[PDB]
Amino acid sequence: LNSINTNPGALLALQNLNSTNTELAATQGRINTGKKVANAKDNGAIWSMAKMQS
Amino acid sequence: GKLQDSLDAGVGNLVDADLAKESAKLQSLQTKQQLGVQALSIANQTPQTILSLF
């Protein structure tokens, strides 16, 4: 329980922080690009469909 | 990343000592060591009593 070498709860909080950082970066990409699908990484089928129609 | 975190947490669950118990065991062993050296001090004087016989 008590230990110096590792505290699992800090690792779990770091994992949730990285997860919210990833969702925040995705939302910021939706902000600047102006599109919910602006590149192949976001959604390949909708992106290729919009590319052919464009 | 999550898997390496869980692996390090498991190795810590195996190896880490529970220091909160170690403080108690340490101070108890210190008190027992001082009582042991002191009782050894009382033990040393037993032979000298017979000097009164001569």
From TrEMBL, chain A:
Location in or out of the cell: Secreted; Bacterial flagellum
Coiled coil: none
Function, in words: Flagellin is the subunit protein which polymerizes to form the filaments of bacterial flagella.
Subunit structure: In C.crescentus, the flagellar filament is composed of multiple flagellins of 29 kDa; 27 kDa and 25 kDa.
Family recorded in the similarity comment: Belongs to the bacterial flagellin family.
Name of this chain's protein: Flagellin
UniProt organism field: Caulobacter vibrioides (strain NA1000 / CB15N)
Full-protein residues shown: 2 to 55 of 273
UniProtKB/TrEMBL annotation, chain B:
Organism: Caulobacter vibrioides (strain NA1000 / CB15N)
Subcellular location as annotated: Secreted; Bacterial flagellum
The protein's assembly and partners: In C.crescentus, the flagellar filament is composed of multiple flagellins of 29 kDa; 27 kDa and 25 kDa.
Family the entry assigns: Belongs to the bacterial flagellin family.
Protein name: Flagellin
Domain (Flagellin C-terminal) ranges: 1-54
Function noted in UniProt: Flagellin is the subunit protein which polymerizes to form the filaments of bacterial flagella.
Boundaries of the shown chain within the full protein: 218 to 271 of 273
